[PDB]
Amino acid sequence: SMEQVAMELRLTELTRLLRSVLDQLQDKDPARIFAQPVSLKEVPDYLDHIKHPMDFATMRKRLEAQGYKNLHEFEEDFDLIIDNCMKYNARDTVFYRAAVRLRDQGGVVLRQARREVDSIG
């Protein structure tokens, strides 16, 4: 149907905007602390601590399968990256502090992305 096609075009356009949001968020992590999943080889106990691991590579895989239906879903995954890190790592660590900075800086980007996703529909 043409209705199904039009919906697909909207998903595709959301996907393009989210790809740029993701690139911008990731630039706020120049150290690449959040680039890849936490290794179970190097933190064998990780899954006893953190129930839903997340990282930028996993987000990117989901995005390219057009697996985010809306900005809310994408933000949930970004928030997991930050929130997981602030639970597993202590306040006085390079990891926790990198999450704080990603959150603060990412908040700016997400504030306007929410307006762009509303605005362009």
mmCIF file of C-alpha atoms in Angstrom:
data_model
loop_
_atom_site.group_PDB
_atom_site.id
_atom_site.type_symbol
_atom_site.label_atom_id
_atom_site.label_comp_id
_atom_site.label_asym_id
_atom_site.label_seq_id
_atom_site.Cartn_x
_atom_site.Cartn_y
_atom_site.Cartn_z
ATOM 1 C CA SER A 1 0.000 0.000 0.000
ATOM 2 C CA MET A 2 0.981 3.590 -0.490
ATOM 3 C CA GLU A 3 0.178 4.238 3.241
ATOM 4 C CA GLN A 4 2.823 1.578 4.242
ATOM 5 C CA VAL A 5 5.363 3.205 1.913
ATOM 6 C CA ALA A 6 4.754 6.692 3.392
ATOM 7 C CA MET A 7 5.292 5.265 6.900
ATOM 8 C CA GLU A 8 8.521 3.701 5.660
ATOM 9 C CA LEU A 9 9.691 7.034 4.321
ATOM 10 C CA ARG A 10 9.017 8.616 7.791
ATOM 11 C CA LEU A 11 11.047 5.769 9.478
ATOM 12 C CA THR A 12 13.858 6.355 7.033
ATOM 13 C CA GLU A 13 13.878 10.071 7.668
ATOM 14 C CA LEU A 14 13.882 9.465 11.461
ATOM 15 C CA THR A 15 16.777 7.081 10.888
ATOM 16 C CA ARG A 16 18.763 9.792 9.079
ATOM 17 C CA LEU A 17 18.182 12.333 11.858
ATOM 18 C CA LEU A 18 19.069 9.725 14.564
ATOM 19 C CA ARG A 19 22.287 8.849 12.754
ATOM 20 C CA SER A 20 23.383 12.490 12.982
ATOM 21 C CA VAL A 21 22.195 12.719 16.628
ATOM 22 C CA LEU A 22 24.275 9.592 17.362
ATOM 23 C CA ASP A 23 27.408 11.086 15.738
ATOM 24 C CA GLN A 24 27.042 14.248 17.691
ATOM 25 C CA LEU A 25 26.561 12.323 20.980
ATOM 26 C CA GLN A 26 29.498 10.142 20.321
ATOM 27 C CA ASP A 27 31.779 13.194 19.751
ATOM 28 C CA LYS A 28 31.060 14.025 23.340
ATOM 29 C CA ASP A 29 33.010 10.831 24.256
ATOM 30 C CA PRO A 30 36.444 11.521 22.660
ATOM 31 C CA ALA A 31 38.053 8.970 24.977
ATOM 32 C CA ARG A 32 35.802 6.251 23.462
ATOM 33 C CA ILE A 33 34.817 4.881 26.892
ATOM 34 C CA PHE A 34 31.283 4.083 25.534
ATOM 35 C CA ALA A 35 32.163 2.969 21.939
ATOM 36 C CA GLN A 36 31.891 -0.765 22.487
ATOM 37 C CA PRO A 37 30.139 -3.219 24.812
ATOM 38 C CA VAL A 38 31.776 -3.865 28.179
ATOM 39 C CA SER A 39 33.873 -7.066 27.639
ATOM 40 C CA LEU A 40 32.679 -10.122 29.660
ATOM 41 C CA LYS A 41 36.197 -11.455 29.248
ATOM 42 C CA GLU A 42 37.568 -8.378 31.185
ATOM 43 C CA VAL A 43 34.569 -7.811 33.597
ATOM 44 C CA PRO A 44 33.357 -11.362 34.037
ATOM 45 C CA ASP A 45 30.854 -10.351 36.758
ATOM 46 C CA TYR A 46 29.317 -7.467 34.664
ATOM 47 C CA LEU A 47 25.926 -9.062 34.062
ATOM 48 C CA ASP A 48 25.425 -9.733 37.805
ATOM 49 C CA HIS A 49 25.542 -5.903 38.146
ATOM 50 C CA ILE A 50 24.014 -4.512 35.006
ATOM 51 C CA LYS A 51 20.885 -6.105 33.510
ATOM 52 C CA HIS A 52 20.650 -4.222 30.204
ATOM 53 C CA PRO A 53 24.184 -3.316 28.882
ATOM 54 C CA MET A 54 24.354 -0.702 26.173
ATOM 55 C CA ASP A 55 27.049 1.026 24.114
ATOM 56 C CA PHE A 56 27.322 3.179 20.944
ATOM 57 C CA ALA A 57 28.178 0.266 18.621
ATOM 58 C CA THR A 58 25.099 -1.666 19.690
ATOM 59 C CA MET A 59 22.977 1.513 19.170
ATOM 60 C CA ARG A 60 24.502 1.932 15.724
ATOM 61 C CA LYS A 61 23.622 -1.679 14.724
ATOM 62 C CA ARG A 62 20.038 -1.115 15.805
ATOM 63 C CA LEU A 63 19.856 2.188 13.926
ATOM 64 C CA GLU A 64 21.030 0.711 10.626
ATOM 65 C CA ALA A 65 18.345 -1.959 10.783
ATOM 66 C CA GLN A 66 15.954 1.065 11.292
ATOM 67 C CA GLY A 67 15.162 -0.377 14.704
ATOM 68 C CA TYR A 68 14.276 2.899 16.444
ATOM 69 C CA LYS A 69 10.544 3.713 15.796
ATOM 70 C CA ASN A 70 10.789 7.048 17.677
ATOM 71 C CA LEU A 71 13.201 9.363 19.578
ATOM 72 C CA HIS A 72 11.951 8.069 22.938
ATOM 73 C CA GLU A 73 13.385 4.580 22.155
ATOM 74 C CA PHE A 74 16.734 6.003 21.091
ATOM 75 C CA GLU A 75 16.979 8.173 24.225
ATOM 76 C CA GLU A 76 16.185 5.157 26.420
ATOM 77 C CA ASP A 77 19.273 3.391 24.954
ATOM 78 C CA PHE A 78 21.460 6.524 25.388
ATOM 79 C CA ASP A 79 20.309 6.852 28.973
ATOM 80 C CA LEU A 80 21.217 3.155 29.605
ATOM 81 C CA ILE A 81 24.814 3.918 28.505
ATOM 82 C CA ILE A 82 25.070 6.694 31.100
ATOM 83 C CA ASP A 83 23.028 5.127 33.844
ATOM 84 C CA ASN A 84 24.800 1.739 33.694
ATOM 85 C CA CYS A 85 28.165 3.431 33.974
ATOM 86 C CA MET A 86 27.146 5.560 36.978
ATOM 87 C CA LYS A 87 25.914 2.498 38.830
ATOM 88 C CA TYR A 88 28.869 0.127 38.093
ATOM 89 C CA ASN A 89 31.612 2.691 38.566
ATOM 90 C CA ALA A 90 32.310 4.858 41.625
ATOM 91 C CA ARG A 91 32.043 8.621 41.641
ATOM 92 C CA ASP A 92 35.795 9.153 41.872
ATOM 93 C CA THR A 93 36.585 7.272 38.599
ATOM 94 C CA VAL A 94 37.466 8.338 35.118
ATOM 95 C CA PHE A 95 34.500 6.210 33.864
ATOM 96 C CA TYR A 96 31.841 7.815 36.068
ATOM 97 C CA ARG A 97 33.103 11.291 35.303
ATOM 98 C CA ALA A 98 33.068 10.582 31.545
ATOM 99 C CA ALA A 99 29.373 9.552 31.891
ATOM 100 C CA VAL A 100 28.545 12.760 33.741
ATOM 101 C CA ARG A 101 30.118 14.801 30.950
ATOM 102 C CA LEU A 102 28.348 12.822 28.160
ATOM 103 C CA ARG A 103 25.019 13.310 29.935
ATOM 104 C CA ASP A 104 25.486 17.073 30.396
ATOM 105 C CA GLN A 105 26.707 17.659 26.888
ATOM 106 C CA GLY A 106 24.335 15.197 25.262
ATOM 107 C CA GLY A 107 21.354 16.932 26.938
ATOM 108 C CA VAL A 108 21.966 20.004 24.713
ATOM 109 C CA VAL A 109 21.884 17.890 21.542
ATOM 110 C CA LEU A 110 18.765 15.947 22.599
ATOM 111 C CA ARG A 111 16.943 19.118 23.559
ATOM 112 C CA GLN A 112 17.019 20.298 19.902
ATOM 113 C CA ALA A 113 16.609 16.824 18.358
ATOM 114 C CA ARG A 114 13.274 16.594 20.255
ATOM 115 C CA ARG A 115 12.191 19.867 18.632
ATOM 116 C CA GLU A 116 13.402 18.619 15.150
ATOM 117 C CA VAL A 117 11.487 15.278 15.429
ATOM 118 C CA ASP A 118 8.291 17.120 16.504
ATOM 119 C CA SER A 119 8.837 19.948 13.955
ATOM 120 C CA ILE A 120 9.560 17.802 10.823
ATOM 121 C CA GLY A 121 7.106 15.118 12.094
#
